[PDB]
Design an enzyme around this catalytic site. Structure first.
Site, PDB file in Angstrom:
ATOM      1  N   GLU E  60     -10.657   3.229  -5.479  1.00 39.47           N
ATOM      2  CA  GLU E  60     -12.025   2.718  -5.557  1.00 39.47           C
ATOM      3  C   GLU E  60     -12.710   2.714  -4.193  1.00 39.47           C
ATOM      4  O   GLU E  60     -13.918   2.951  -4.100  1.00 39.47           O
ATOM      5  CB  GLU E  60     -12.028   1.313  -6.156  1.00 39.47           C
ATOM      6  CG  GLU E  60     -13.413   0.783  -6.498  1.00 39.47           C
ATOM      7  CD  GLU E  60     -13.378  -0.642  -6.986  1.00 39.47           C
ATOM      8  OE1 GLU E  60     -12.371  -1.030  -7.607  1.00 39.47           O
ATOM      9  OE2 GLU E  60     -14.355  -1.379  -6.743  1.00 39.47           O
ATOM     10  N   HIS E  61     -11.964   2.415  -3.130  1.00 43.50           N
ATOM     11  CA  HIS E  61     -12.517   2.432  -1.779  1.00 43.50           C
ATOM     12  C   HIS E  61     -12.842   3.828  -1.267  1.00 43.50           C
ATOM     13  O   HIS E  61     -13.588   3.947  -0.292  1.00 43.50           O
ATOM     14  CB  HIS E  61     -11.563   1.757  -0.799  1.00 43.50           C
ATOM     15  CG  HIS E  61     -11.639   0.265  -0.815  1.00 43.50           C
ATOM     16  ND1 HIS E  61     -12.024  -0.467   0.287  1.00 43.50           N
ATOM     17  CD2 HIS E  61     -11.395  -0.634  -1.797  1.00 43.50           C
ATOM     18  CE1 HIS E  61     -12.005  -1.752  -0.011  1.00 43.50           C
ATOM     19  NE2 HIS E  61     -11.626  -1.881  -1.270  1.00 43.50           N
ATOM     20  N   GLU E 137      -9.676  -7.266   3.920  1.00 48.00           N
ATOM     21  CA  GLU E 137     -10.139  -7.905   2.694  1.00 48.00           C
ATOM     22  C   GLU E 137      -9.071  -8.803   2.095  1.00 48.00           C
ATOM     23  O   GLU E 137      -9.404  -9.820   1.489  1.00 48.00           O
ATOM     24  CB  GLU E 137     -10.586  -6.874   1.659  1.00 48.00           C
ATOM     25  CG  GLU E 137     -11.883  -6.167   2.003  1.00 48.00           C
ATOM     26  CD  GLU E 137     -12.229  -5.067   1.016  1.00 48.00           C
ATOM     27  OE1 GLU E 137     -11.425  -4.817   0.094  1.00 48.00           O
ATOM     28  OE2 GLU E 137     -13.313  -4.461   1.154  1.00 48.00           O
TER      29      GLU E 137
END
Lengths: 105, 52, 423, 20, 446
Positions: E60-61, E137
């Site tokens: 996704e990143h 994160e």
């Protein structure tokens, strides 16, 4: 003027004088038995009326301690005894009955 | 006096709770008969009868 | 395939009241009463009255007790909300179609006949402290409130939240006076989605005819300039630097909106580099630590504020601020291509259409137009007005920012954050 | 996208969390 | 003059079509000037093994960082130039990428989506740069107590199974995930019969189908030899995890029992029951007069700052329960009142509160599907879970069937005398012992 109303006024005046709470300088609403509705109604009072009620009750309790009464010129008059706790207690009872009616459904 | 308990909700609650109270009544009845050895009722029970 | 869409209807009554209806065919209805009663109309003697008023919508009214309002609304699963800006208060209500009559009756009672009982008002006061604290754990709310306090001398300087020293001191009389002199027919607008026009007109004519008596012309907002600095040793420094820009509804405001989207308003891609944001790339050249920067645009009836907002490390605050200011100077000097302004116009038009795609945003847009302009301007005319903005207007707006007297607000460890005269 | 861009709005509701 | 039901019939039907490779294309036409279009994929951390856990979250990143055709930030500029907004998310069972854009820009937006799900290069420099980003994160995410307690709840409830894994994966996995692991993950999961191209807004279904056959026909619909992942049922475990940390100022507690899954009809009745319990926050305006007994008691006695009920659904299992936040000296009272309300609904549910819950669910259903993006999400997700779009008239039919008896039976079936999973975090010294919690799940009087 009505004769029946006249008799009712006379009987009520007689009973007021016979009850004797006026001899201690109290008002009628001072002598009410305090339960949850009355507790809330007293909690809603303004400052001056609350302080007056407190002082009247305190003086009455002191007179009761000493087994005395006020002089006859300081007794509460029947005609001037106007209820101060009527609208507050009325509104509190009205709200409680509305809650009960909702609970029935 | 106690008129506040007259409404549809309170009769739905009673209808929901009468089977449980019925069973706790059967529990108490059987418990009393058992604890007191009530011959008037136990004579009718099949296998229990032989005790007397 | 859906039916043919009905166009909105609009009506101004002779008493000044505005009714606006749209009969759609959605299963739910939405109704809102917009009032010119924001915090700007407070003065130094009754500050905070509109905050407490915003929290008192469920208090007892002349036609419905508080218990009845709460249980009646929750019984049919509806909703009641009160949204407040510095200029407007918006009492909005949502429910399914068949119960609008019920909830309409509650809305008028909330707005036209509150009692503000002394004990109920007294018991509500501590919630002011809770509500402000929850709001004030976002640093942006602190900074923006100080920014307005520094920019203006009066009316728009007032905060949306009650000053701490006033918590417990707001009286029922002040609430009565505020409702009596701000909640009047000439200051109100009744908007409705999923409701028929005769019904709204009947409600307005029956129950909102006893709200006359206009008054309290307030006072025009006098822009001042100044700086407020809050040393609190937070991890990051938040800073906002703005100048006076333009009143809403003017042609210059469109030029400022386009300048906002040329400089960069907000991100469009999740975890993106903000490639087409000229401020972000300008700061990114000579600043390698993490940071954020965004153009700030706030427009009101008679004034406006434009500038930028920075978030950065305490030691890099001056670098980020000076780099952003130089990038705006470079734009003011005419270094602006035509593809840049065309992309900015595309971003603006898309943002506008996306901002009225929800029923909430549509209702809010219609209520705002109803109070500001007294009319409804459809979307296509708004896109027309956006396209007409020329590049020279954007350069002139940048000149106005560069040459205008600055206002500044900052929070954090400010040992390396410059003053205005150091920029 | 934490930087502010537009002026504040304060929301209060009967049966929904407040927001800013 | 129109009724609620007639308005429910006027909603347009969601058209559905399927390509030859198996890609399902679904759309709901409106008269809106804007639209939302996107791809919903049946992939998530439940499909990942212990070795490659966190692979999808890593992907996704990288989805928006460059492709073979549009390298670097060229894609970001193309998206930005037409004023569109590009977004994505990953869960334990579903991955989604979607664009919000003008209707006129629909041809280019679909093209970009095709470019993202097929042509991803994963530059080594980008893998290494996103490594430290993800690690940072994880450090940030450690500070959200809500996310922590919900990951603990999954970790203990479904212990020993794939659902116990977190979406982001452990710290050690992210620092050694190689490029070969990511390409193997993509070539093994981004297959055509597991994706759904959903759209909603001003657009004809014909043109969406044409763009689909134009840019997705090359997608690989032929699985490897006898290779097809199947989700095994996940053993639920009644258990407890307590992270005592007194340095924090408020306790977070999440408790839940085992639910049935996505396709069980009883979920409708369960959603009615949770609506009876509702939710609360310290910023609510109602307070003492709130209908929910738990909410009014909590407001008057200050038992908590907030609570919420939830029903999280998965394939053939789920987490049904509640979560709350409170001072360290209030945990026992909140637990007591909560369980008391569960037992009350199990044994003595009345008609009026059930009509309340039905009305709340009707309003929540209608108010949620308001806009192009929630509708596009409901299309894609419904086509993955239910295999079809369930019209609102059907939901209304299922809701009307629910009465008090149905609620008493369903609640007794799932709550009464069942072992819960408990997760506690913060100053939780007063959190009751597991035996006492378990004893709280029945009534001696019943």
């Amino acid at each position: 003027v009505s004769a029946s109303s006249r008799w009712l006024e006379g009987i009520r005046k007689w009973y007021y004088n016979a009850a004797g709470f006026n001899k201690l300088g109290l008002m009628r609403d001072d002598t009410i038995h305090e339960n949850d509705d009355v507790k809330e109604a007293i909690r809603r009072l303004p400052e001056n009326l609350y302080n007056d009620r407190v002082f009247r009750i305190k003086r009455a309790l002191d007179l009761s301690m000493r087994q005395q009464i006020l002089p006859k010129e300081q007794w509460t008059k029947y005609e001037e005894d106007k209820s101060y706790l009527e609208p507050y207690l009325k509104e509190v009872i009205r709200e409680r009955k509305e809650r009960e009616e909702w609970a029935k459904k | 006096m106690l008129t506040r308990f007259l409404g549809p909700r309170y009769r739905q609650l009673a209808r929901n709770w009468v089977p449980t109270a019925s069973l706790w009544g059967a529990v108490g009845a059987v418990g009393l008969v058992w604890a007191t050895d009530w011959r008037l009722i136990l004579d009718w029970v099949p296998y229990i009868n032989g005790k007397f | 395939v859906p039916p043919h869409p009905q166009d909105l209807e609009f009506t101004r009554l002779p008493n000044g009241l505005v009714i606006a209806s749209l009969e759609n065919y959605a299963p739910a209805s939405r109704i809102g009463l917009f009032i010119k009663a924001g915090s700007r109309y407070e003065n130094s003697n009754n500050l905070g009255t509109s905050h407490l008023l915003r929290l008192a919508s469920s208090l007892t009214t002349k036609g419905a007790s508080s218990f009845k309002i709460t249980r009646g609304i929750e019984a049919v699963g509806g909703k009641l909300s009160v949204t407040s800006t510095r200029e407007n208060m918006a009492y909005t209500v949502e429910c399914l179609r068949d119960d609008v009559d019920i909830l309409m009756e509650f809305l008028l009672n909330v707005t036209t006949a509150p009692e503000f009982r002394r004990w109920e008002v007294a018991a509500l006061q501590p919630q002011l402290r809770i509500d402000k604290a929850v709001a004030l754990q976002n640093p942006q709310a602190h900074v923006i409130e100080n920014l307005h306090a520094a920019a203006y001398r009066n009316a728009l300087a007032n905060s949306l939240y009650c000053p701490d020293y006033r918590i417990g001191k707001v009286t029922p009389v002040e609430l009565h006076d505020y409702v009596q002199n701000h909640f009047t027919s000439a200051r109100m607008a009744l908007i409705g989605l999923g409701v028929s026009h005769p019904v709204l007109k009947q409600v307005a004519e029956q129950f909102l005819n006893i709200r006359g008596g206009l008054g309290l012309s307030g006072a025009k907002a006098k822009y001042h300039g100044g700086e407020i600095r809050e040393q609190n040793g937070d991890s990051l420094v938040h800073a906002a630097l703005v100048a006076e820009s333009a009143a809403i509804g003017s042609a210059e405001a469109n030029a400022f909106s386009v300048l906002q989207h040329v400089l960069g308003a907000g991100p469009h891609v999740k975890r993106g580099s903000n490639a087409t944001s000229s401020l972000y790339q300008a700061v990114a050249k000579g600043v390698h630590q993490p940071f954020d920067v965004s153009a700030f645009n706030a427009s009101y009836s008679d004034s406006g504020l434009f500038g930028f907002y920075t978030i950065s490390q305490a030691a890099s605050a001056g670098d980020v601020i000076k780099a952003a200011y130089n990038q705006v100077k470079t734009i003011a000097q005419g270094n602006l291509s035509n593809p840049d302004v065309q992309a900015a116009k595309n971003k603006l038009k898309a943002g506008y259409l996306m901002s009225v795609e929800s029923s909430e945003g549509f209702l809010d847009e219609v209520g705002s137009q109803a109070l500001a302009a007294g009319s409804y301007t459809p979307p296509s005319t708004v896109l027309q007005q956006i396209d007409a903005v020329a590049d020279a207007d954007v350069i002139n707006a940048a000149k106005k920012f560069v040459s205008g007297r600055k206002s500044m607000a900052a929070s954090g460890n400010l040992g390396h954050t410059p003053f205005i005269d150091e920029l | 996208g934490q930087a502010a861009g537009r002026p504040l709005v304060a929301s209060v509701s009967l049966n929904v969390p407040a927001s800013v | 003059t129109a009724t609620y039901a007639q308005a429910l019939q006027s909603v347009p039907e969601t058209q559905v079509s399927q390509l030859d490779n198996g890609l399902r294309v679904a759309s709901e036409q409106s008269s809106q000037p804007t639209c939302t279009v996107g791809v919903w994929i049946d992939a998530g951390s439940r499909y990942e093994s212990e070795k490659n856990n966190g692979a999808g979250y890593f992907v996704e990143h990288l989805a928006f960082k460059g492709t073979k055709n549009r390298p670097g930030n060229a894609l970001e500029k193309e998206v930005e130039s037409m004023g569109a907004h590009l977004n994505a998310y990953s869960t334990r069972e579903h991955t989604a990428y979607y664009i919000k854009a003008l209707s006129k820009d629909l041809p280019k937006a679909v093209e970009l989506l095709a470019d993202i799900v097929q042509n991803c290069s994963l530059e080594d420099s980008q893998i290494e740069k996103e490594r430290d980003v993800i690690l940072q994160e994880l450090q940030e995410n450690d500070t959200s107590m809500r996310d922590v307690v919900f990951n603990y709840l999954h970790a203990t409830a479904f212990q020993g199974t794939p659902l116990a894994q977190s979406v982001e994966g452990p710290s050690e996995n992210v620092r050694k995930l190689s490029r070969a692991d990511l390409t193997e993950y993509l070539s093994r999961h981004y297959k055509a019969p597991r994706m759904v191209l959903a759209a909603a807004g001003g657009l004809e279904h014909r043109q969406l189908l044409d763009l689909a056959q134009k840019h997705f026909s090359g997608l690989s619909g032929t699985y490897d030899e006898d290779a097809v992942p199947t989700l095994s049922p996940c053993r639920f475990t009644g258990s407890q995890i307590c992270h005592r940390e007194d340095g924090l100022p408020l306790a977070h507690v999440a408790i839940a029992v085992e639910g049935p899954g996505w396709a069980h009809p009883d979920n409708v009745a369960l959603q009615v029951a949770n609506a009876i319990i509702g939710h609360y926050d310290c910023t609510y305006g109602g307070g003492a007069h709130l209908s929910s007994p738990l909410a009014s008691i909590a407001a008057t006695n200050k038992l908590c700052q907030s609570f919420q009920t939830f029903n999280i659904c998965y394939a053939d299992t789920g987490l049904l329960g509640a979560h709350f936040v409170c001072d360290h000296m209030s945990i026992d009272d909140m637990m007591f009142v909560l369980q008391g309300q569960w037992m009350r609904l199990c044994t003595s549910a009345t008609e009026s509160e059930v009509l309340r819950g039905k009305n709340l669910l009707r309003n929540a259903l209608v108010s949620h599907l308001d806009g192009t993006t929630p509708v596009c999400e409901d299309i894609g997700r419904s086509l993955l879970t239910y295999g079809r779009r369930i019209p609102l008239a059907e939901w209304e039919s299922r809701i009307a069937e629910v009465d008090a008896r149905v609620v008493r039976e369903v609640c007794s079936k799932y709550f009464y005398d069942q072992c819960p999973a408990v997760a506690g975090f913060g100053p939780i010294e007063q959190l009751p012992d597991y035996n006492r919690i378990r004893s709280g799940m029945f009534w001696l009087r019943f």
